[PDB]
Design an enzyme around this catalytic site. Structure first.
Site, PDB file in Angstrom:
ATOM      1  CG  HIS A 139      -0.477   0.133   2.469  1.00  0.00           C
ATOM      2  ND1 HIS A 139      -0.042  -0.855   3.207  1.00  0.00           N
ATOM      3  CD2 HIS A 139      -0.315   1.535   3.160  1.00  0.00           C
ATOM      4  CE1 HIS A 139       0.425  -0.235   4.490  1.00  0.00           C
ATOM      5  NE2 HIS A 139       0.507   1.112   4.538  1.00  0.00           N
ATOM      6  CG  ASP A 158       0.130  -4.022   2.722  1.00  0.00           C
ATOM      7  OD1 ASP A 158       0.625  -3.673   1.684  1.00  0.00           O
ATOM      8  OD2 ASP A 158       0.132  -3.392   3.804  1.00  0.00           O
ATOM      9  N   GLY A 172       3.207   6.557   9.112  1.00  0.00           N
ATOM     10  CA  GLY A 172       4.534   7.200   8.848  1.00  0.00           C
ATOM     11  C   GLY A 172       5.470   5.770   8.924  1.00  0.00           C
ATOM     12  CB  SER A 186       2.707   1.872   5.909  1.00  0.00           C
ATOM     13  N   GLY A 187       5.465  -0.305   6.121  1.00  0.00           N
ATOM     14  CA  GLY A 187       6.441  -0.796   5.031  1.00  0.00           C
ATOM     15  C   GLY A 187       7.541  -0.934   5.969  1.00  0.00           C
TER      16      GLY A 187
END
Ligand SMILES: [Ca+2]
Lengths: 56, 213
Positions: free
Chosen positions: B40, B84, B165, B167-168
């Site tokens: 995402h 994801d 902030g 994410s990932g």
């Protein structure tokens, strides 16, 4: 104006930090908020112009 | 990150910042030319920033590299957030040193209870020590929303969690990347710990994808 324009900005469950625009009826203009990156609601625009055009 | 602490400068050398004008997601360096992040976090143009501590100041240890190829898992679902995960190939190999290093992919799936380190800028890099939670508790917190490709990490009482902030970003346990910051309802709320992509289910996809690109 459309009903979704009166709903508060929705960050969503995702944890990205993406700046988007939303119509703040209380103030009468489009401001920015942090969108999480997924499951956006309708009061969420990529620019001030589109926000004001749709919810102005 | 809520209830966390500022990481010791450069103590998380595999952490990267994804920037397309401003910081919007995190990621992890798995080899000198590839980064893994959340699907995402996709954007057509992405600049990867390595060796960062303070995202708002040029410190001297940073390396800025543009993404050459961005590959999302073919089964990523934008609604359920299943699968994801995304791979980013850099335009050129980065220089590995004490401030820029790779993190190992999991040798197996870590069991519930394993202590891990979560990091991100969600402007100094923040750190959080938290355990992988039992799948049963994860499912109980998110009724019918958890798949086998997700794992909860954190505390059921809330107070500490990853947030927008992050994410990932990486969830590293015993030197291996076990999770990727993905989603959750709010941040650090009781009965809603953060949900992460379970990396151990994607080792083969990651390796096969890197070999074909
Ligand atoms: Ca910096």
């Amino acid at each position: 104006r459309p009903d979704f324009c009166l709903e508060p900005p929705y960050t969503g469950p995702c944890k990205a930090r993406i700046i988007r625009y939303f119509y703040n009826a209380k103030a009468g203009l489009c401001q920015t908020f942090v969108y999480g990156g997924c499951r956006a609601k309708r009061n969420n625009f990529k620019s001030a112009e589109d926000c004001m055009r749709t919810c102005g | 990150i809520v209830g966390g602490y500022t990481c010791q400068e450069n103590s998380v050398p595999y952490q990267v910042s994804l920037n397309s004008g401003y910081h919007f997601c995190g990621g992890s360096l798995i080899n000198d030319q590839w980064v893994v992040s959340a699907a995402h976090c996709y954007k057509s143009r992405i600049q990867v920033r390595l060796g960062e501590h303070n995202i708002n100041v040029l410190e001297g240890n940073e390396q800025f590299v543009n993404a050459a190829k961005i590959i999302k898992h073919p089964n990523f679902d934008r609604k359920t957030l299943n699968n994801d995960i995304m791979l980013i190939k850099l335009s050129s190999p980065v220089k590995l040193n004490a401030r820029v290093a790779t993190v190992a992919l999991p040798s197996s799936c870590a069991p519930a209870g394993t202590q891990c380190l979560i990091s991100g800028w969600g402007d100094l890099l923040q750190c959080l020590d938290a355990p992988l939670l039992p799948q049963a508790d994860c499912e109980a917190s998110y009724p019918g929303k958890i798949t086998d490709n997700m794992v909860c990490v954190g505390f059921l009482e809330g107070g500490k969690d990853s947030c927008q902030g992050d994410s990932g970003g990486p969830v590293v346990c015993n030197g291996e990347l076990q999770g990727i910051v993905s989603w959750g309802y709010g941040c650090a709320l009781p009965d809603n710990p953060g949900v992460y992509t379970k990396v151990c289910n994607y080792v083969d996809w990651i390796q096969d994808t890197i070999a074909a690109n």
